[PDB]
Design a protein around this ligand. Structure first.
Ligand code: SPH
Ligand code: SPH
Lengths: 41, 246, 240, 296, 240, 99, 41, 48, 50, 48
């Protein structure tokens, strides 16, 4: 319910804080998905 | 079943018997610039078979006391093939790449290479001069080596101040002479603009560092070469005019 | 006008305040955003990535050899190969990894960690190692009959040249501070030691000196608390 | 139809599925109980770092764990709340004395001058955000004195002031802030003003074409999409007010988006725009110990 | 009263702020408005209008002759007639047109442009020209075999004495700044050159010297970014 | 010669692609063009012992300073509401509690 | 949803911003509409 | 801006006032509470 | 005046104009000596539960 | 560096000791004659 006193969007304070993680693009950026409990090779 | 692999692009193919994986950089495939992100109004050109193929650079001999090499992209492919000609005739260039580095060795040699990509691999001048008018800056041939590729002077800092330890956050892959013999990386177009020039700004750089130095017993093969091959994928060019080499 | 009252806290500038500010350019429309791959939303995506560990941080070990722990054919069994403390906020090996350089920007850390050990020896050279993480208490063990009592994993060489020991979250408090020393050692996390399980057996005409690459990272239950100014950078004058 | 190698790929070159879907993670991950498993062929500990993928061996798969409804928070780790704290950016020195007959000071907007915030905002390669600027202004001794000041923003292209009372200070179009030295710091909000789609702190390339030297390559890496103009400051007066003045600038990064993370710098800084260092004094990231098997 | 707190930014005067102000005359009713033709609502209506281009801005070309590029019967073929850079923010020909004097009030511009070439020669005199806009790269071409590679249009004389070459929006960034020089040439837009396609053929008893009027304007996708103080006016003292 | 400007757009001259142009045009409207305050006039009140006047007078005329005159003279007929702001300092730029 | 604290309309801030263009009165102020792809004369 | 008027009592610091204060750490999540026996809510439990 | 909060671990200032005062991450309060007292709110920051 | 431009395949040794490069049918005419030499080299097929 935060508010902005000016008509410009870049004057607001913390418009939206988000909880969105996606580590599988840095930790597992591979082609064929390796299983967690199988042998890699 | 997973060690064997075959890549095929255009009129070229690459086999491999011991490499086990395909690192897709940042989990995104190379794609064409969608209309919702394009800024140039002209129509680009998309050969897709004349340029999309595996160009094999020269080979670098891994010595017992080597220090590592780096290449710039698409700097390497600016004088070879139809890719070179398109990049010399067009102003706006966009493309992803598929890297493949091979360094085979017998089951008695030992060593490990780190093969990584550094988006915007800005090099640094090695010198303690703090005034910006006398400070040392890397020459043009040291920052855009070309097809030959350049060597490092102190790889522990990647010639860019940053340490090599954390460089593993980048799309990377090891070449461990006990398990695999080649590493491959599919990297998309990484840039803050839809298109960009191909002779001024190099999107990223390739890094090959011998972390675990080459070691072998007497009698084995001493000439252990490293070969890199590159395939530009989903390439587009725009802004046609006379040929400008640089 | 409307009756108001000014309270303590007026005219102050709290550098971490979350408030509005008058724009300079009215009716502004920035440059539209495009799709740039590799967007990061939270630093916990960075702590999960493996980064090499300067575990051979001794003098007379200059250069890239700091990232390599040596391995050689030992004539004496039950012998120690390497050791290091598992406190990322502490100075030492963890000071080089990413989790250890980003855990210094915050004060308190929580969650498990993991350490991957990749063998860079020859293919014909085999061996076994014992990686033992010992929770706090006395100093590092003397013999491995004492280290086997802590959390540990026995790593076999061969194909799949990398094992990964997970340092669990064994603590009293929900969080540990990054600072150690003095009476802050109450927040110590223990020591992880790598012992020769059996040996480094190697056939003829194969080097008897190999190396092991230690990489560190945070587990999936890693979390951080109040921000903090890092202590890894120093500046005297402005960068002109 | 007549030639179909051209249609077979046109209708096959759509958006290729690159599934890496994330989920909304409110709190840190808990754990599930695990007993002992004596099974062959299923090894979660054996990994392969050569695949470029990090180990996925979690706790439950390695040791016998209990279950814990982890209620710890992860909100203070998001980059929004990581860059939401203002820090020093630049300081100007306005010596409006009798010997310094200039009257105005000028500051090229460049946040790469102070390491504290540079080290943070350089761990990411491409950043897009809105800034919140705050100007504190004191004397050389730290005193406040009722003298009115004018801060003008000179975008790239506008004429920079040439004197204390030159015409450029009319600010008919340039945004400007008039504030007294004995008032709260002046705070404004600035949007994402780059011509590109994101600020880049590392630009591996040159701005222009042409032949590039090898001795003094002073133009390498300098991207123009970063330079965002100039900041001029004066004291509103016709004659000189004899005082030494010092204006500090703090910037907060809100509505932040970062891209392509980067290793955090280890060697000290030497230049503002360039990432120079010295090969003679390479400061290793890890402090030295006595022996390797002697963890302190 | 109501508890409040003053934040940083009080008592400041931001010249571009968008706020209310106490009126001086309460209960005021201004003079009613009437219909005055020719109302303009946005400056993009002004950028679309063609205005002449001082393309002959050489020394020893004083007066109105700056608005005229000469054309004459050339004995040598493939010859260059005129050239100029297509950067409105740059100093030069565009500095005279309207789009070029109003693009200086803003910092960044985007969108295509157009250049109309009106022939003011005799009626019996014919000819052909080649108008070639070359995107950035090297300097202007040397011969027209090099210029033909860029964007271009071949203009035939006769009835409908004016052709219009549209300079498309060929760039990397969504916006280009008005400032050039130094490392701002990264925002250069290229050069447009007018070459003699075939010749300027003329019958007897007709002047062999004609002129061409170059006019410039912005296309329909022209847009502008942050305001800015122009640099085309100078004042020393008050106008008393 | 028809007095009309050329209408040759891009699609009709060269082969173009399609682009969902998302650029903004709001900062080009005259509202947001004149929405920025600028200097108009400056008065000099020398209330000293030698100047026994005590008051200053200024004929309201914004045509005295070129910066804003050059803008508001590109249009011939203008109708608007003004928002005036008076800063007042000494000759040195000091503030002193005088009403 | 902008607001004015005084009962006088000329004290508001930016009451209404509008997107209304009409270039065809400066660019094509002619009697008979010229087509975009035909010859003018 | 909105017309206001400052009343007597401004800029004072009443040590027993019940008001808000700007936080220093935005987006903060403290250490979760556990069950500690022997919670006291009012001093009248102590007087008995 | 400038009040800086130095959590356990951060480098403590070493001089009047040292670099630690840049407070790029540390919370800080800038306030004049002739202003109302500076007031902030601090949460339960212990690593323990109490 | 000149040969890599044609059709090619990179053969790795190890298990499956035989690779097979397929020389595609890249020609102008539907057929090539068996005779070469002289002005019959117009029917040449290239070099591997
Ligand atoms: C009257 C108000 C004056 C203060 C406002 C000045 C405008 C601020 C523009 C900031 C531009 C984005 C932040 C700057 C980023 C980096 O400094 C540049 N990319 C180069 O270092
Ligand atoms: C007590 C308040 C004093 C300040 C208010 C004074 C009244 C301002 C009237 C402004 C009239 C419209 C703006 C003036 C326009 C031009 O100066 C004139 N048309 C002639 O130059």
């Amino acid at each position: 319910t935060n508010i902005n006193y000016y008509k410009d969007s870049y004057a607001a304070s913390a418009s939206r804080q988000d909880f969105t993680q996606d580590p599988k693009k840095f930790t597992q950026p591979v082609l064929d998905s390796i299983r967690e409990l199988s042998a890699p090779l | 079943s997973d060690r064997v692999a075959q890549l095929t692009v255009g009129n070229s193919s690459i086999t491999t018997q011991e490499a086990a994986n395909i690192v897709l950089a940042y989990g995104e495939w190379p794609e064409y610039c969608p209309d919702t992100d394009a800024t140039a109004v002209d129509k680009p050109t998309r050969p897709d078979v004349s340029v999309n193929r595996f160009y094999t650079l020269d080979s670098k001999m891994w010595q017992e006391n080597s220090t590592g090499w780096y290449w710039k992209f698409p700097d390497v492919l600016n004088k070879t093939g139809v890719f070179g000609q398109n990049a010399q005739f067009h102003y706006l260039y966009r493309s992803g790449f598929c890297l493949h580095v091979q360094c085979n060795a017998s089951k008695f040699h030992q060593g490990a290479l780190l093969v990584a990509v550094i988006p915007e691999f800005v090099l640094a001048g090695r010198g303690s001069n703090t005034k910006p008018n006398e400070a040392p800056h890397p020459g043009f041939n040291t920052t855009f080596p070309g097809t030959a590729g350049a060597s490092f002077n102190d790889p522990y800092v990647l010639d860019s101040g940053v340490p090599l330890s954390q460089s593993l956050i980048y799309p990377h892959q090891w070449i461990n002479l006990r398990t695999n013999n080649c590493a491959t990386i599919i990297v998309p177009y990484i840039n803050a603009v839809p298109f960009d020039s191909a002779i001024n700004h190099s999107n990223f750089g390739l890094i090959v560092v011998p972390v675990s130095p080459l070691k072998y017993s007497s009698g084995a093969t001493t000439a252990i070469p490293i070969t890199v091959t590159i395939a530009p994928l989903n390439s587009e060019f725009g802004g046609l005019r006379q040929a400008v080499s640089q | 006008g409307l009756p108001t009252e000014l309270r303590p806290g007026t005219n102050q500038f709290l550098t971490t305040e979350d408030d509005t500010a008058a724009p300079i350019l009215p009716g502004f429309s920035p440059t539209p955003s495009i799709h740039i791959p590799g967007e990061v939303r939270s630093l916990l995506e960075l702590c999960r990535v493996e980064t090499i560990l300067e575990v051979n941080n001794t003098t007379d070990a200059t250069g890239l050899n700091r990232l390599l722990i040596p391995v050689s054919a030992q004539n004496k069994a039950d012998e120690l190969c390497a050791a290091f403390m598992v406190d990322p906020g502490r100075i030492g090996p963890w000071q080089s990894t990413l989790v250890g350089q980003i855990c210094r920007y915050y004060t308190q850390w929580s969650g498990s960690l993991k350490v991957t050990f990749m063998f860079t020896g020859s293919f014909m050279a085999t061996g076994k190692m014992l990686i033992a993480y010992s929770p706090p208490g006395s100093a590092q063990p003397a013999n491995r009959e004492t280290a086997m009592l802590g959390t540990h994993v026995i790593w076999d060489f061969g194909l799949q040249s990398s094992v990964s020991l997970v340092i669990p979250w064994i603590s009293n408090t929900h969080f540990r501070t990054a600072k150690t020393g003095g009476n802050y050692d109450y927040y110590t996390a223990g020591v992880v030691t790598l012992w020769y399980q059996t040996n480094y057996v190697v056939p003829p005409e194969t080097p008897g000196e190999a190396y092991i690459i230690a990489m560190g990272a945070a587990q999936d239950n890693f979390t951080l608390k109040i921000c903090k100014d890092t202590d890894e950078v120093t500046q005297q004058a402005v960068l002109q | 139809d007549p030639v179909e190698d051209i249609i077979h790929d046109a209708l096959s070159s759509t958006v290729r599925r690159a599934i890496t879907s994330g989920q909304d993670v409110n709190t840190a991950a808990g754990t599930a109980p695990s007993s002992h498993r004596l099974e062959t062929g299923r090894v979660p500990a054996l990994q392969a770092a050569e695949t470029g993928a990090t180990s996925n061996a979690t706790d439950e798969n390695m040791i016998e764990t209990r279950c814990v409804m982890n209620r710890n928070g992860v909100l203070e780790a998001t980059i929004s709340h990581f860059f939401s704290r203002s820090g020093l950016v630049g300081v100007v020195n306005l010596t409006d004395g009798g010997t310094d007959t200039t009257g105005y000071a000028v500051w090229d907007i460049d946040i790469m001058g102070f390491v504290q915030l540079r080290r943070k905002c350089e761990m990411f390669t491409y950043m897009r955000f809105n800034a919140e600027f705050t100007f504190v202004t004191t004397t050389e001794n730290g005193e406040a004195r009722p003298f009115m000041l004018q801060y003008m923003y000179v975008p790239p292209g506008a004429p920079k002031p040439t004197g204390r009372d030159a015409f450029q200070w009319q600010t008919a179009t340039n945004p400007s802030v008039f504030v007294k030295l004995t008032d709260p710091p002046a705070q404004v909000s600035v949007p994402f003003m780059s011509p590109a789609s994101a600020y880049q702190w590392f630009y591996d390339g040159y701005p222009t074409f042409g032949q590039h030297p090898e001795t003094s390559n002073t133009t390498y890496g300098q991207c123009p999409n970063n330079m965002m103009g100039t900041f001029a400051v004066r004291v509103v007066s016709r004659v000189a007010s004899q005082l030494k003045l010092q204006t500090r600038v703090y910037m907060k990064l809100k509505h932040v988006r970062a891209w392509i993370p980067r290793p955090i710098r280890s060697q000290p800084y030497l230049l503002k725009n360039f990432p120079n260092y010295d090969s003679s004094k390479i400061t290793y990231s890890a402090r030295d110990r006595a022996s390797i098997k002697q963890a302190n």
